[PDB]
Design a protein around this ligand. Sequence first.
Ligand SMILES: *[C@@H]1O[C@H](CO)[C@@H](O[C@@H]2O[C@H](CO)[C@@H](O)[C@H](O)[C@H]2NC(C)=O)[C@H](O)[C@H]1NC(C)=O
Ligand SMILES: *[C@@H]1O[C@H](CO)[C@@H](O)[C@H](O)[C@H]1NC(C)=O
Ligand SMILES: *[C@@H]1O[C@H](CO)[C@@H](O)[C@H](O)[C@H]1NC(C)=O
Ligand SMILES: *[C@@H]1O[C@H](CO)[C@@H](O)[C@H](O)[C@H]1NC(C)=O
Lengths: 106, 99
Amino acid sequence: FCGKGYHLMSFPQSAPHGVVFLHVTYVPAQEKNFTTAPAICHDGKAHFPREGVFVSNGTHWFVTQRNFYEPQIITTDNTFVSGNCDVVIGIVNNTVYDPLQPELDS
Amino acid sequence: AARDLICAQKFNGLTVLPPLLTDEMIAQYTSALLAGTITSGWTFGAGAALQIPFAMQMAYRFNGIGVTQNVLYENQKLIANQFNSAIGKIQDSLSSTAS
Ligand SMILES: *[C@@H]1O[C@H](CO)[C@@H](O[C@@H]2O[C@H](CO)[C@@H](O)[C@H](O)[C@H]2NC(C)=O)[C@H](O)[C@H]1NC(C)=O
Ligand SMILES: *[C@@H]1O[C@H](CO)[C@@H](O)[C@H](O)[C@H]1NC(C)=O
Ligand SMILES: *[C@@H]1O[C@H](CO)[C@@H](O)[C@H](O)[C@H]1NC(C)=O
Ligand SMILES: *[C@@H]1O[C@H](CO)[C@@H](O)[C@H](O)[C@H]1NC(C)=O
């Protein structure tokens, strides 16, 4: 509706017998391939990302947001549990870090 | 032996100009749009096309309409069957009713 890309701003400028808009937009620039998974098996549970996707760089699994590559360690705070591993097609195996365990140990 | 209405119009001076874009070109545009939508979602409308599995794209759609994505990841086969049946019903409605 207002410029190609994700709209941020617009600025009106007058003109003879009309108006001119200066649409400001966000456009992604540099892509990168990753291997992605819909959910993760952990202790028989299926973890889904709260906001982001499960990507991997070949060895480890991280969770990012969709519009910018910001990898984060998969924990129980950025993921939620639903069901078991026998339903989701394409589920993978990975560990999910629990922040309470180090505090319990210490 | 049978004079045509188009022949009469042509002889009387009313001409129909051809369109610039052919039907093959229009079909190429629609095929490109379909392939981009299927293989990238909305990302091809805001820059460069980003590949993504179609199950993940439908999970994005479900989160967009306010439904948790585990619904799709647990009813994927049922949803695919419903979509295929709806497409078949569209075909049957088009092949029978012309109005
Ligand atoms: C995938 O990313 C992880 C996280 O950065 C990498 O793991 C670290 O890699 C650096 C060097 O790249 C090492 O110094 C660290 O010791 C690694 N940490 C752990 C916990 O393994 C991993 O190497 C990356 N893999 C690939 C193939 O790029
Ligand atoms: C990803 O893989 C495809 C496979 O052919 C390749 O063409 C492409 O250059 C790779 N990188 C990106 C950013 O798509
Ligand atoms: C992915 O695509 C391939 C190619 O058709 C197919 O054989 C496979 O079943 C699909 N799913 C998975 C999880 O590999
Ligand atoms: C994940 O681990 C379970 C047992 O812990 C195994 O049955 C399953 O095949 C594993 N998944 C994959 C993709 O290897």
